[PDB]
Amino acid sequence: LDDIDRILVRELAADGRVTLSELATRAGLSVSAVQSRVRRLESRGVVQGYSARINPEAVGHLLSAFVAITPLDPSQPDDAPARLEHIEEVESCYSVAGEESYVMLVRVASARALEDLLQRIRTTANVRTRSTIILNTFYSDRQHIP
Amino acid sequence: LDDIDRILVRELAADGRVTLSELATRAGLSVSAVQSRVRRLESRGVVQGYSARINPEAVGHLLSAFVAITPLDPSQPDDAPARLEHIEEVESCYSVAGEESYVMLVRVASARALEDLLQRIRTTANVRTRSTIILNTFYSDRQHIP
Amino acid sequence: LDDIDRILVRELAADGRVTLSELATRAGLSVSAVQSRVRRLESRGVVQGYSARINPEAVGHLLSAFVAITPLDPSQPDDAPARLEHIEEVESCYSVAGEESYVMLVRVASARALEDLLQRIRTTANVRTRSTIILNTFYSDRQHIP
Amino acid sequence: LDDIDRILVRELAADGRVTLSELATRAGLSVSAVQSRVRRLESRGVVQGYSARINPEAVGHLLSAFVAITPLDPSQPDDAPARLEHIEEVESCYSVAGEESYVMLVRVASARALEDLLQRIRTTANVRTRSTIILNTFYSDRQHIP
Amino acid sequence: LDDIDRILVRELAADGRVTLSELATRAGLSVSAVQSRVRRLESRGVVQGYSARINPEAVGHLLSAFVAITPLDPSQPDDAPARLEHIEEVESCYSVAGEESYVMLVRVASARALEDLLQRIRTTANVRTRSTIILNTFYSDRQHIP
Amino acid sequence: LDDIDRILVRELAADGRVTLSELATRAGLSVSAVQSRVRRLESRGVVQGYSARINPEAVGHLLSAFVAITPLDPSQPDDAPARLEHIEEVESCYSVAGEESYVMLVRVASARALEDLLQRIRTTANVRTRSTIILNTFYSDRQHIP
Amino acid sequence: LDDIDRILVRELAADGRVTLSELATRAGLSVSAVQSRVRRLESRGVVQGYSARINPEAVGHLLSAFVAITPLDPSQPDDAPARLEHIEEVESCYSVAGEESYVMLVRVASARALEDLLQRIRTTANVRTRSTIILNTFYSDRQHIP
Amino acid sequence: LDDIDRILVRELAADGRVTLSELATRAGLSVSAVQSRVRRLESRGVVQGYSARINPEAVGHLLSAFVAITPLDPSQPDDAPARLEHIEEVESCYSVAGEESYVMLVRVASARALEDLLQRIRTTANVRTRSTIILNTFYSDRQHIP
């Protein structure tokens, strides 16, 4: 990323609401040159989205957990993340090295809800489920723009 | 959260850039009302931030990982998340049930950088470190607003 | 649970032998009004039972164990607790977060009855079994009513 | 435990509210002879108590957990159960064979009270702590008298 | 075991070769009595055998190991010790609590031989195998007769 | 071992009571040549002893366990087996590869006895203790003379 | 080996490039008889190869890992090494004692290529897979000729 | 590397013994300029060495193992690889992600020598040690030049 893009990325990561005019002033660009650079940052996938961060608990998600899953049949391509991505309670899904194949961050209303979610996940994608429950989120979603 | 705050939160989650005017028509209010509710939602910590979400790889973060940490002396209050908070490579920090005390999502430039970070974490919070490297992110930060 | 139900519950927890007449006095109620409260507390599963607690060792159960079970086919609802509940040696059965799906407190005459019980559990509910043997009970059955 | 003590124990286990007069009738005894048997059963820790069992959830304990603890300095007697027994959230405490030294059943208001309880346990008794969170109790407190 | 059987067992444990006459003076009986008690102790399974203890290394057993096994289908009665009994490299076989179902002490000529044995065990009893290699035997078969 | 020694070792391992005359006949030797060969087998440590195998349970050892121990300070030579060999309840002690440093087979009268033994072991040799309890011994002490 | 091979191997271990002639003078022997000894060491498998060691990183292998594999049905001869031999990213393959059956050192271009390779390995040999990613290699390939 | 180094490395990886002259003709270049490129590949660390690979077994290394080590105080820079570098039985040393900090491939004469070596490693670098013994190496040192 060139110097200008870095400035733009910095600013957007600091606050996604920063305006084209604000960005233009800060990067030393005209508004049209910024709007072009931002659009390109978005289409190259550098900027992924602008969703406001919402407190999960405030919307009823009183329980969150990391869920580690393992294909019940590891010898075939499991396609677990595609098979599960319609599940709204799954906030994220990663393949990982180690004992399990994927880790997912999951949010539910209650313990009972979690248990139900786990069963739905296991049947939907034919996987086993290991749950690590979160007691508290100290901080999150802190991006580091070097 | 009354039905109206519900819509504001929804719209904000969909796109943090949504303007006061667009919120006013979508909600059915004035922009001064919207503005006030929104400032309220922010102060109550319901709306936590507006940072744009950046592809970590685009700014040089080629290696991501979960790091589970455990204090070397569990009998003392460790204050590990507070002690590590200034470390920018730490995106998120959770206390969890189970064997380890906290799990963190960490991003770094490379394997070598990861090894440096792990040592810095251990020295800074007096903890042991167990790292689960992410191979791929299939999807993430998918906030569910029921 | 209102203030009066709390007094009743806190009285019954201290000793399940407190008479309805003693409850009424203590709670500020007529005896016919306590009667109807208590019946409602029972049918609402708040008050679960009045069994006097008996030392399991004193009646032949010289070996107790925690048994963690994990369904062999996670892809399907196992209904393990329901499949196992006629097994009288099982004093309690909880679903849990983590590697295993359920933990049970189990009471048996000997190590060898333990071994038989384990197999009967595994065959009955199609699960694997991992047992943690209890060496001593220092205290138990302590109910705290805040 | 003779045949008559067995009848008494089996009667008290079914319902701790059975009167001495009912016990005598059922056991074949005078009421003064049952009285002295029952007193002896109590002081011998055979009959441990008469508490009515209360649903922990119904009284604010919306999170239960099993907590496995392991002394930080195994070379010395830890007396952990004794050091922890004034902690009212601890319903039960067992020494166990295996990796950890003790397992406790613990009841708390929330995940965050759980986190506080854990630290207080670790500091009080100088142990490490590993928790397994209970999602659902299917049945418990089932006493079997052969 | 009366005091006299006690002495016989003691002497036998000290040296299986002890003769009837030596037992008679040490016990304080005739040799026909001794003889009878001894045959009794053997039949009741108290005295289990008289095999001399051989250094496994001297007969070519250069590698020893504990092997913990777990049936691949825990829901079936595995009969693993019975199924493996004819395998001569298996010196001992125990059912144990915990994760694995049985632990065995096994002796073989070499590492390669160990790998062959492990496969034979797995095929024969339909189990998985987890091997803990012995590096040194400091002392063994020390029978304590109180 | 030459052909004659093998015959002698075979016989002694089959039954430690076999006489010099029996051995002489079976190996084709005179009694004096056998008594010389046996004595040499003993002093070279090929024959380790002649203790009769006694049923642990018959002498009061109702509980046996494998105990895995780890020096509390692994950086210094622990000398654990020498430090513990005066403990009569320790039947055997092995250094092993894997997570723990040694495995010992242990025999005690009861669970309470075990717990006490474990503490004594931990203090005596400054080690941590992991106990795997034996539920049943299917067979043991089966030597294999190839 | 003999006194003269002990030198051929020691010298060839120093660097394979050492010429027949240099070997002769160092072995006191002759260029021909020394070249037949070397031809033999090679056929005896003592000398396994002459490859120069190349930095894997320099050739685009930026991600290395140990991969522990376990047959999905351990009850049959899995033949995994042979079945996986054709896969070039596998540098080495060992059977080991412990929980997994084999470990392999593996070299790939990227985290995404590792994820692909792992799937390829699981499918080819019908195994599950647990990877330990290398962050740095401080030294390697150091053979000690005693 | 460039188009010409891609061949020097590929050829040297085939067998280090390939002479300057053979390299020239295959690189289309000259014996001198080709010998300076090779001198550079060597100083660039691309070509790390020319040792012939010797069967460790053939030189009396009958016991090989992976040794995973963890600093006993992970809160400080342990410098373990460097501190252990002088130990010749260590063939390789890697930092890894996961529970332990490093794994080393180790070669010794015997189980007893391994036990000694492990102690030596723990004392030198102040670490604990977990060994995974190799039973067989099916193939090794296979470098793939893409």
The CA-to-CA distance between both ends of chain F, in Å, stands at 11
Chain G touched by E130 (CB under 8 Å) = yes
Q: How far is D18 from chain B (nearest CA, A)?
A: 43
Residue E127 to residue E118: CA distance in whole angstroms: 10
Chains G and D touch (3+ CB pairs under 8 A): no
**Residue H73 identity:** D
How many C-beta atoms surround the C-beta of residue E21 within 10 A? 11
Residue A120 to residue A100: CA distance in whole angstroms: 18
CATH class of the structural domain B54-134: alpha beta
Instruction: State residue F30 phi and psi, 5-degree precision.
Output: -80, 165
Instruction: State residue F129 phi and psi, 5-degree precision.
Output: -125, 120
Chain A touched by G131 (CB under 8 Å) = yes
Query: Which tokens is C35 given?
Result: 């009667």
Helix (H, G, I), strand (E, B) or coil at H33: helix
**Residue E48 identity:** Q
Yes or no, beta carbons of C129 and E98 under 8 Å apart:
no
Helix (H, G, I), strand (E, B) or coil at D70: strand
Chains D and B touch (3+ CB pairs under 8 A): yes
Contacts of C31 (CB under 8 A, 6+ apart): C20, C21, C24
Of H106, H108, H79, H107, nearest to H95 by C-alpha is H79
Domain ranges across chain A: 2-53, 54-134
Query: Which tokens is D53 given?
Result: 């069992």
Residue E82 to residue F65: CA distance in whole angstroms: 21
- Contact yes or no for E42/F58 (Cβ under 8 A): no
Q: Residue B28 carries which DSSP code?
A: T
Contacts of B98 in chain C (CB under 8 A): 98
Give residue for tokens 């490039």.
G17
User: Pick from C112, C135, C136: which is nearest to F135 by CB?
Assistant: C112
Yes or no, beta carbons of E53 and F50 under 8 Å apart:
yes
Chain H touched by E112 (CB under 8 Å) = yes
Chain H touched by B119 (CB under 8 Å) = yes
Helix (H, G, I), strand (E, B) or coil at E29: coil
Of A35, A1, A39, nearest to A19 by C-alpha is A35
Yes or no, beta carbons of E127 and G97 under 8 Å apart:
no
Q: Where are the beta strands (DSSP E) in G1-146?
A: 47-49, 53-54, 63-71, 90-96, 102-108, 127-139
Chain A touched by C103 (CB under 8 Å) = no
Positive or negative torsion for Cα E115, E117, E118, E122: positive
Contacts of C140 in chain D (CB under 8 A): 91-94, 105
Query: Which tokens is H125 given?
Result: 């670098």
Neighbour subunits, C (≥3 Cβ pairs < 8 A): A, B, D, E, F
Yes or no, beta carbons of C95 and A114 under 8 Å apart:
no
Contacts of E133 in chain G (CB under 8 A): 97
Of H91, H77, H65, H66, nearest to H126 by C-alpha is H77
- Best of G96, G103, G114, G117 to disrupt the H interface by mutation (most H CBs within 10 Å)? G96
User: Pick from E111, E114, E136: which is nearest to H112 by CB?
Assistant: E136
Measured CA distances, C76 to A123, C103, D29, G89 (Å): 6, 19, 54, 37
Q: Name the residue in chain C with its Cα closest to that of E75.
A: C123
Q: How far is H138 from chain E (nearest CA, A)?
A: 11
Greatest Cα-to-Cα distance within chain C, rounded to the nearest angstrom = 55
- The number of C-beta contacts closer than 8 angstroms across C and E is 24
Q: How far is E11 from chain C (nearest CA, A)?
A: 30
Yes or no, beta carbons of A114 and D135 under 8 Å apart:
yes
Helix (H, G, I), strand (E, B) or coil at G80: helix
- Contact yes or no for F137/E94 (Cβ under 8 A): yes
- Contact yes or no for B7/B13 (Cβ under 8 A): no
Chain H touched by F96 (CB under 8 Å) = no
Measured CA distances, C123 to C78, C80, C102, E92, H63 (Å): 12, 11, 16, 26, 42
Q: Name the residue in chain F with its Cα closest to that of D77.
A: F119
Chain H touched by B123 (CB under 8 Å) = yes
Alpha helices in chain F (DSSP H): 3-14, 20-27, 31-43, 80-84, 111-125
Q: How far is C52 from chain F (nearest CA, A)?
A: 26
Contacts of H108 in chain F (CB under 8 A): none
- Contact yes or no for D66/C96 (Cβ under 8 A): yes
Q: How far is C22 from chain D (nearest CA, A)?
A: 14
Contacts of G30 (CB under 8 A, 6+ apart): G24
Reduced to 3 DSSP states, what percent helix, strand and coil does chain E have, rounded to the nearest 5?
40, 30, 30
Q: How far is A43 from chain C (nearest CA, A)?
A: 39
Contacts of B73 in chain D (CB under 8 A): 72
Neighbour subunits, E (≥3 Cβ pairs < 8 A): C, D, F, G, H
Measured CA distances, D44 to A88, C135, D37, D39 (Å): 57, 20, 11, 9
Correct CATH for H2-53 of 1.10.10.10, 3.30.70.1450, 2.40.30.20, 3.30.390.30: 1.10.10.10
Contacts of D88 (CB under 8 A, 6+ apart): C142, C144
Chain H touched by E132 (CB under 8 Å) = no
Give residue for tokens 């022997």.
G29
Measured CA distances, F91 to D14, E139, F80, F108 (Å): 45, 8, 14, 11
Greatest Cα-to-Cα distance within chain B, rounded to the nearest angstrom = 56
Q: Name the residue in chain F with its Cα closest to that of E42.
A: F54
Q: Name the residue in chain D with its Cα closest to that of B78.
A: D119
**Residue F145 identity:** I
Method used to obtain the model: X-ray
Q: Over the range D3-36, which residues count as b (16 or more CB within 10 Å of their CB) and which as e?
A: eebebbbbbbbeebbbeeeebbeebebeeeebee
